[PDB]
Symmetry: D2
Subunit: 388 residues, 4 copies
């Protein structure tokens, strides 16, 4: 009935989101830069729980070790003044020209070593600030042409980089875990580990796989036309959903980073249903950009909308699942049977069961309707608040 966020809703925002100045491939900035301190206070007033950062959002690139300490101390004061937390941090290995062919998988070996040292420096800072999750988006790991990158050698280099970071945090005794954020393309013509599946598969080849999970992003998987709730379910099934980036996207095109709820609204409904029913307990992090049409009042309006739309969808998904009429429809569509083992009786009892093959009435089974359209219209009526 009310949709006001509280810090217990665990909503978080990156400094780079509300701080995006509006520069796009075809145009100049439309907004002035925001001081991180002002973003923290403004987000706290809207009901956020916390903020996240790349190293270069907080400390401008090339900063003297003394300008560094000043930047951190001011940030830390705003956090103390507001109650805001920093649950995640990440490294910028994509903006500076030295990263034009990648960080961890750049063809030049000296660049790969620099990327790792820049990363390690920021992990120390993240731990100091209490982050629990360290995200890695390899936005420049990839290629525009086929001969430029041997992908097996590049995966060797990627594995080597994450293995060294794992060695570092265990040797330091830090309680932080890594989350890889996949994206299929942009800014490289194809990016390595392009989807949640490719990232999950890669993690299983690392020396200490339990330290690594995924940070899927709504618009990223939709840039490949994939079903984001399905990919999150696979991640939850694997025990690897360590963090999540929420935003909106209208289909297969450039990464729009719209506010959450915009883009594919029904996919947002099913995503919230899944996160809340699985008991996901991490941050609900928004990685979005207020459109460059907006001034600063529109920036805060867009950020508030992220939170509002999550809380409306949560309410509607909870109402859906609690409705006795929906629970009966789920049984009518045999969702209860899907959850039962196919063959708990075992292989030999399955091979000897004539009711499973020799005497199975296929025509009778085929004729049973699944009743999925009635179930889906109940879900639509619940989403639109049109139940009677």
């Amino acid at each position: 009935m009310n949709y006001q966020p509280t810090p217990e809703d665990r909503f978080t925002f990156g400094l780079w989101t509300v701080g995006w100045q509006g520069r796009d491939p075809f145009g100049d900035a439309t907004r002035r830069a925001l001081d991180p301190v002002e973003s923290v206070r403004r987000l706290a007033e809207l009901g956020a729980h916390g903020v996240t950062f790349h190293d270069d959002d907080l400390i401008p690139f090339g900063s003297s070790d003394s300008e560094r300490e000043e930047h951190v101390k001011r940030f830390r004061q705003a956090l103390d003044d507001t109650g805001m937390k920093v649950p995640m941090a990440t490294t910028n290995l994509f903006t500076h020209p030295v990263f034009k062919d990648g960080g961890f998988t750049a063809n030049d070996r000296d660049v790969r070593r620099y990327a790792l040292r820049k990363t390690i420096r920021n992990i120390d800072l993240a731990v100091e600030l209490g982050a629990e999750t360290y995200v890695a988006w390899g936005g420049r790991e990839g290629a525009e042409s086929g001969g430029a990158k041997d992908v097996r050698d590049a995966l060797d280099r990627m594995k080597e980089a994450f293995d060294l970071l794992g060695e570092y945090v265990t040797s330091q005794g830090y309680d932080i875990r890594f989350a890889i954020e996949p994206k299929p393309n942009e800014p490289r013509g194809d990016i390595l580990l392009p989807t949640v599946g490719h990232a999950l598969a890669f993690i299983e080849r690392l020396e200490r796989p339990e330290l690594y999970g995924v940070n899927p992003e709504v618009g990223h998987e939709q840039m490949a036309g994939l079903n984001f709730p399905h990919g999150i379910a696979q991640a939850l099934w694997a025990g690897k959903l360590f963090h999540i980036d929420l935003n909106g996207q209208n289909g297969i095109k450039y990464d729009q980073d719209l506010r959450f709820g915009a883009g594919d609204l029904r996919a947002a409904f099913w995503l919230v249903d899944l996160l809340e029913s699985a008991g996901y307990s991490g941050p609900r992090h928004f990685d979005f950009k207020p459109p460059r049409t907006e001034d600063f009042d529109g920036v805060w309006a867009s950020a508030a909308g992220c939170m509002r739309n999550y809380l409306i969808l949560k309410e509607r998904a909870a109402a859906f699942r609690a409705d006795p009429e929906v629970q009966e429809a789920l049984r009518a569509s045999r969702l209860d049977e899907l959850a039962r083992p196919t063959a708990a009786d075992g292989l030999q009892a399955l091979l000897d069961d004539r009711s499973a093959f020799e005497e199975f009435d296929v025509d009778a089974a085929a004729a049973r309707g699944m009743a999925f359209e009635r179930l889906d219209q109940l879900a639509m009526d619940h989403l639109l608040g049109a139940r009677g």
Copy 2:
């Protein structure tokens, strides 16, 4: 100079490819059915190595155990008469109406048990015929709506099914391995395990993962806008490329199954370069459909073209890699450095190396061009046969 296939090129075709009668969602068949025996002889004359089948391509559905033995015996005679092999087989768990909500992940438990028994029956037949690989394409495992399928429960059911098949073949002592073929959509609105990455990740959760790999298909990954040579490289890196389906696709749309070489021609070039340089030794299997515009002469013309275009691209990719001018360009673009470990000296020596951070000249590194456009035009000149 010549592009004539021989059975040592290991080219294989499914019975359902040249046997496709032309029925599409909007139109009736344009060709009569082909007898499997005639396809085997015709393909042998074109230079193919072997054929593959679904159970229902070879033995019509509902066949009496005696009509079954007759169908197999005639097939076996054509194989003996021609020298053709059967390296792969698979199950049809998608055409009959009983599979309308899936085989292994159908919501109805009796259908899941039937799907497993239909599968086990055909694995026995495949082994008899000497297949080494058993493919599974879960074309109906998926959903058109969000509430119809709990994807975590469905992955539990999928895992249970593959685990039971693994138990079966090990208990029988068979030397056959499984290959999962991913597809993102069609005929379901979203299919589970939609890409090579999602399939690789799933395999790592099976009880005996060494028995399972992937069977990627060119057009399937391109239906998600992904780079097929990159996904095959990840599969090779994981040691899981057990089989491959070759065809062409023009972008993100329905699955066209064009002949190999059609669709994205440069991606075909880089795919052949990779398979030949990695020493892939399995079958080069074509899963394609001669367009329904064609009569039977056009069917055989289309099948021959599959093989011809593979052999032309092999020649051009070999010429590319053998060209001393290309080898120098690869060094100019530092492909040799990509293959060297980033930090064989180890974590502590990396942390103490001032040349990796405190004293790294980032501006000098950033200014080095990668020379990728010159390398890519050499690759284009080689593909087009325009070297001078």
Copy 3:
């Protein structure tokens, strides 16, 4: 508050929609055929206004002239018994194998002449039944390969065909208009006139352009990733929206034909807002397929849902536009200024207006925010019924 359709809502359905038996490229029919008479009565009971047909839906192909009259007479009795109307009809020039390379643009001239005679026969029948609109979907006009179709010659043939149909209806004195339905692909690899824009442009080259408009389909334009409300606005602007096909689609993939409201829900909201605010008065026609998972109860449930979701969205869009808070936000975002002429003062007064260039303060204009995010969240709150 209630969402019950009445025939005054003008909802119509094709016989082929609820009558779809479930055959897809990978599977057999899951439902038995429906008699047209039974569909008319069932749709009338749900509150529909009318039905539409292809010639071959009503009269099976190759029917004797006497079996033809029997089929029509029974249909006509069901229409009289129910009050149902037939506002649109169309020709099937895509299912029979003779149309495998097209109807009006088939390379074989004898097929093009046959396609026109099959068409003319059905226009006479449509007029008899009182249809006002005759739709043409050239589903087989197109190509899978570049050399198979010279597109300039094919457009000449397409123009010739529509010009002859225009000559026919004017020479007969019939009051019927034509609507071309674009689709980008499927079942041909690329279809001619692939989008609403290409069809609008083509019409302007016909000899009697006032007889022709478009019949856009939601999922068709979304198969090219386009904004369907924007394309309908262009069609309305041109005075050419003669009919519309409503359904749902999840992105760029095969044509799903989901029920209306499914697929991209926010695009459905903006489409209904536009049709109702522009005063579109034609039929609201559903061209959809109940998924093949469903039995006949699910078919009728899916058809009812089409109508229900239109009436819910109509209510929400009307509430949006009537809200004084939204009307103020529209002014804040200068929608009122967009509707004023840029230069009613004329070219010379614009060239002499220093306030338009020499003395325009660009920095002050640039700094004004558009306030679009606040407006869009008001639209979201209205769609979800979350206004407070």
Copy 4:
């Protein structure tokens, strides 16, 4: 045998192409700015015919009328020194923040008037420099959300703007024509007039349609998954191909602007075949970006490759069409029949021709194969230089 361009090949480049500094949505510039004078001389040495510009590429924004004359005079000297021409020019109505909601269709009326005056100023300069074509790419005309733009009012404003520009050039007596360049998205979430078809349709509603054509761009239509040679054929058929932008694109994703020949190579082959067979006589203009991985030697290498790949494809397409074996295959596939009128005998003779319907043997027609696969493999062999 040789692939060296000459200025008689009419190859042209925009100043912004080779001058692109490498700034993308995620990263800083990797190359220093180029002086226009140096680009003209470098392009002349590679064999180009001419260059094109936006006003702001040549004269930096806000320039004093005296700094303006200096910039133009230096440019004019480089043109005189090199023999280079300027066949096209265009306006930048997308980079400055004042254009964040559009130029001609911005909601603010004062911005629309400014956009027209900025445009008119540059048309005068273009004429002085001898351009024959004035391009308009409305990159900011569009929306990220549904309520922000009434598209009928925006098309009214767009029509008003182009009508005033037409009035201007006719009142001045200038011999210049306009070309509208469509793009479906990026940088706006959806752009108005998103495809060649929508632009062609819009032109027909202008007061003086003969002054306006299209400037299609390879990658733009492919961002909607459309067939670019088909859209160019429709433009040629309408008599509206006034200019063309050549580049490469790998599928539906952000606009990559790769060099021509990269991206979809077979579509490039069929495009060149069509332009050369239709006798297109305008500039072959490259609108591309050397990837930001490259230094200045890679920039010139990429530009040279544009020209080289056009000349290789021209040679291969000419060889295809001249091959007697291909000419026979075209007849076998009835391309000659496609070019004959369907019914030159007229409507009444068609209605009385029993051979067109009552006595047409549909089964015999249906059984004829189109032989398109053999024709397409001849085209593939010609493209790859594999004829024997």
